[PDB]
């Protein structure tokens, strides 16, 4: 479920970026960034009580 939260937040960012992404050459990076969910997993396994 923390995994899904991270994926949903990532969907938010990738959604904004695709529309900002002019060309379709944006899948790898302009669509993908692991910072949010990666840190979310860290938060649950460390910052979760």
């Amino acid at each position: 479920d923390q995994f899904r939260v991270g994926l949903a937040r990532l969907a938010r960012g990738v959604r904004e970026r695709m529309l900002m992404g002019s060309e379709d050459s944006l899948t790898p990076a302009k669509l993908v960034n692991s910072r949010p969910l990666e840190a979310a997993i860290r938060e649950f396994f460390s910052r979760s009580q």
Binding site: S22, E23, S25, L26, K30
Partner: protein, 361 residues
């Protein structure tokens, strides 16, 4: 809709296409980082391509497609040796100077400091000693002798009326200027932008000259932009400020892969400030050409007010034939012993008779 400009890449990976004024402008065209990575574009790259009006919430038009980079197709931009990787060598190919309104000056230059392509040249004179007028003559002579070369006229911290005169008298070659009314920051920005454009053009095997009036004023701007560096050099100069002018000037070089950058810049001396003399000495160790003009020779109203003995180039054998080399050696032997004003007047009298090749004969 088509737009054109020179690429300026920002810290965020996206860039803008600029106009001749070499500054942020409202009409600058956006270039996404995607296109930059696509075409391996680099600062100073001249980009032409279709663009569209900015969408709602967009303040600048966006480049819809890249068509030509530095007047050529984008493909070659991917696969090309980088300017910094080009082999720097001596200028192995000379240019003969001749300008109709003053052939005396061009011929005297030919006999004193021959010019090749890739030249790192400098002219050193006190104020009011034929510097600006001489540079005008060289510009005109190039635009008559070397039309193929992208001639760029850069004027830093200098007089507005001189900008107008050269703009009008350059017959269309790129004149970029930034008067003393401008702050040093504008000067540095424009100079570096022009520099990057020139390097990008030469990357394509292109031949460029940059005629830079007031390289000393550029060095002054570099000093003032240098935020601390700690200690101050004698005469009021900063230790690390001169690194940028040095690199700037030393970029000019002969390329064994085609094209080259030749920078002819003007140096001020005998100004009563240790700063100017230190700048002169510092650039002299980097330049391959020094042409001296004497203030006294000006004061007598005899032109071109050149100091023959101090002037000369390095490796004349690479720009001159043996006959011309030995002629020049003979002439310098004759002129070494006798005074500047007398020497210049006498040389003018001899050279007024005929073109150089006949005065040889």
């Amino acid at each position: 809709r088509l737009v054109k400009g020179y690429l300026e890449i920002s810290q965020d990976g996206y860039g803008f296409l600029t106009e001749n004024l070499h500054n942020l402008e409202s009409r600058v065209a956006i270039v996404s980082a995607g296109l930059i990575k696509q075409y391996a574009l680099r600062a100073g790259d001249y980009v032409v391509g279709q663009a569209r009006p900015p969408r709602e919430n967009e303040r600048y038009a966006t480049l819809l497609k890249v068509e030509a980079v530095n007047n050529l197709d984008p493909e070659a931009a991917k696969n090309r040796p980088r300017f910094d990787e080009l082999t720097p060598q001596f200028p192995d190919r000379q240019i003969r100077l001749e300008t109709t309104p003053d052939e005396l000056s061009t011929r005297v230059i030919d006999l004193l400091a021959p010019i090749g392509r890739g030249q790192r040249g400098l002219i050193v004179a006190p104020p009011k000693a034929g510097k600006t007028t001489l540079l005008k003559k060289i510009a005109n002579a190039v635009l008559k002798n070397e039309p193929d070369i992208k001639v760029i006229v850069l004027l830093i911290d200098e007089r507005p009326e001189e900008v107008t005169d050269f703009r009008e008298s350059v017959q269309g070659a790129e004149v970029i200027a930034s008067t003393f009314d401008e702050p040093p920051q504008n000067h540095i920005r424009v100079a570096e932008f022009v520099h990057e454009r020139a390097k990008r053009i030469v990357e394509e095997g292109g031949h460029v000259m940059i005629l830079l009036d007031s390289i000393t004023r550029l060095a002054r701007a570099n000093n003032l932009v240098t935020p601390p560096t700690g200690r101050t050099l004698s005469g009021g100069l900063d230790s690390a400020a001169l690194y940028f002018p040095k690199r700037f000037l030393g970029a000019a070089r002969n390329i064994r892969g085609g094209g080259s950058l030749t920078i002819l810049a003007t140096a001020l001396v005998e100004t009563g400030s240790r700063m100017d003399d230190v700048i002169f000495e510092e650039f002299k160790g980097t330049g391959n050409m020094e042409l001296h003009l004497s203030r006294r020779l000006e004061e007598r109203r005899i032109f071109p007010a050149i100091d023959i003995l101090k002037s000369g180039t390095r490796r004349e054998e690479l720009l001159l034939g043996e006959e011309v080399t030995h002629k020049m050696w003979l002439l310098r032997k004759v002129l070494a012993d006798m005074d500047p004003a007398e020497a210049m007047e006498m040389l003018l009298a001899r050279l007024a008779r005929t073109k150089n090749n006949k005065e040889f004969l």
